[PDB]
């Protein structure tokens, strides 16, 4: 009647707005919109900080590039937003924090391009390490890349330097980087950016954890995994490239246990 459509959306949070004209509806993970911590589930007793529009707004991370050789990308939350404006400051000044998110993945191309990205949001996205001599050895620094994220690989390559081990993840793409088959990742909240259909993915994520609130600096609640289910192609070019951009807004974030700021060892 007025022409409203699944494909055309506007999202506004704080001082930020996203528009899209080629959406494929949007997902609310497990049917649960983000929410503040109810009194009946509360646990730290101090009055929480709730930054509201100062932190619940769209932050855009560094753009990456999709090519025919890309195996996939991953980020962790809250880690990818640790250095984002007042969200990052509130996270590091407090022992505890909780937050939900709107995740908007952006990737446009043309009616002559093809390819499809699976965009998965995974609760507790534990990834496999690079070692066959020690388990659970990925270091804090390598497990937490911040906004640059990390990547998947098509080949497991064990680290053989036992003198100074690399201590990083070696996440194999068809094993979802965690020992399970990628074809089943669709039981996690997801969308697919299939270039002939849509140019974005939107996932609204509730805070998920076995606790009401926890250490954001120690623990990532959600992982975002983006993998090419169908490879990028274009006209008859051998090396096409198109960018992928992530923009994420915290939602209903609240924090407890205020003290001096955490200054983490990140390199």
């Amino acid at each position: 009647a007025c022409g409203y459509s699944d494909r055309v959306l506007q999202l506004t949070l704080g001082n930020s707005t996203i528009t899209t004209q080629e959406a494929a509806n949007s997902v609310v993970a497990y049917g649960r919109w983000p929410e503040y911590l109810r009194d009946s589930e509360a646990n730290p007793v101090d009055q929480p900080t709730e930054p509201d529009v100062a932190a619940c707004r769209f932050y855009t991370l560094d753009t990456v590039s999709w090519t025919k050789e890309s195996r996939g990308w991953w980020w962790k939350l809250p880690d990818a937003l640790r250095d984002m404006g007042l969200f990052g400051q509130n996270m590091y000044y407090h022992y505890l924090g909780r937050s939900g998110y709107t995740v908007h993945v952006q990737c446009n191309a043309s009616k002559f391009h093809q390819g499809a990205l699976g965009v998965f949001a995974v609760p507790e996205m534990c990834l496999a390490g690079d070692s066959n001599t020690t388990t659970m050895h990925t270091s804090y620094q390598n497990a937490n890349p911040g906004e640059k994220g990390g990547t998947f690989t098509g080949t497991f390559t064990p680290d053989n330097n036992q003198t100074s081990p690399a201590r990083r993840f070696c996440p194999v793409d068809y094993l979802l980087g965690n020992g399970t088959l990628l074809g089943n990742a669709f039981v996690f909240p997801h969308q697919i950016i299939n270039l002939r259909t849509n140019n974005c993915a939107t996932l609204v994520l509730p805070y998920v954890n076995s606790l009401s609130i926890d250490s954001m600096v120690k623990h990532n609640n959600w992982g975002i995994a983006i993998l090419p289910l169908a490879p990028l192609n274009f006209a008859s070019e051998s090396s096409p490239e198109i960018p992928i951009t992530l923009t994420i807004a915290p939602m209903c974030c609240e924090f407890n246990g205020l003290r001096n700021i955490t200054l983490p060892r990140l390199q």
Binding site: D6, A24, V27, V204
Partner: protein, 68 residues
């Protein structure tokens, strides 16, 4: 303090003045104060799978185009 519940009868004996038909019940009495000590009742609920099969914000009407 007995709990009496009904059984879902699968194979029925040739009987309706004792077994197969006139609802066969069973009895449970808990012997312990701690509920962790209890047996499982198996009287469990089901739910709609929608939070996993249809987690989209705008309702899916299957006879309609998904994209519109």
């Amino acid at each position: 303090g007995a709990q009496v519940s009904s059984q879902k009868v699968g194979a029925h004996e040739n009987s309706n003045r004792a077994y197969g038909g006139s609802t066969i019940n069973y009895t449970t009495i808990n012997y312990y104060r701690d509920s962790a000590s209890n047996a499982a009742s198996k009287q469990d609920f089901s739910q709609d799978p929608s939070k996993f099969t249809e987690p989209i914000k705008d309702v899916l009407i299957k006879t309609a185009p998904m994209l519109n």
